[PDB]
């Protein structure tokens, strides 16, 4: 539903700067990203209702990630998420 294909492409440039991607494969990536996001967002909303939080913060996202992401994916994602939030809340 939402278009993240151009950001997928930038990430691809980062991980494999000599590698392209086909249009159908990019479409699959966009679909997967959207579905994963919908799951995280639904879970985070459910967690904020359950915990009576008025505002969805990275605390609810992080818990949703732990609940939804299999094993080491969760660990690495939590690391990345925490890193990003630290950077955002610091000076630059």
């Amino acid at each position: 539903k939402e278009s993240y294909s151009i950001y997928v492409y930038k990430v691809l440039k980062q991980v494999h700067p000599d590698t392209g991607i086909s249009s159908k494969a990019m479409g699959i990536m966009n679909s997967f990203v959207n579905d994963i996001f919908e799951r995280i967002a639904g879970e985070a909303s459910r967690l904020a209702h359950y915990n009576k939080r008025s505002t969805i913060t990275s605390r609810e996202i992080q818990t949703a990630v732990r609940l939804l992401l299999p094993g080491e994916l969760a660990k690495h994602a939590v690391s990345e998420g925490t890193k990003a939030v630290t950077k955002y809340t610091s000076a630059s």
Binding site: I6, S22, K24, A25, S31, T55
Partner: protein, 60 residues
């Protein structure tokens, strides 16, 4: 008398076929297709809404 292993691989085989079907149908199928052009990458802007940097926030 019947043997014990008779058909004991059938349900693994069915699960394998179901997984095959899952990857052939999900997101249009994880399958190559003739005419699948290269994705041509048209960057876009990212503006935050007014309520992006909102304030986010027992005894005993």
């Amino acid at each position: 008398a019947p043997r014990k292993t008779a058909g004991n691989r059938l349900s693994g085989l069915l699960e394998a076929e179901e997984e095959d079907e899952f990857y052939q149908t999900t997101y249009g199928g994880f399958t190559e297709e003739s005419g699948d052009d290269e994705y041509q990458g048209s960057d876009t802007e990212d503006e935050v809404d007014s309520d992006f940097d909102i304030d986010e926030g027992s005894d005993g």
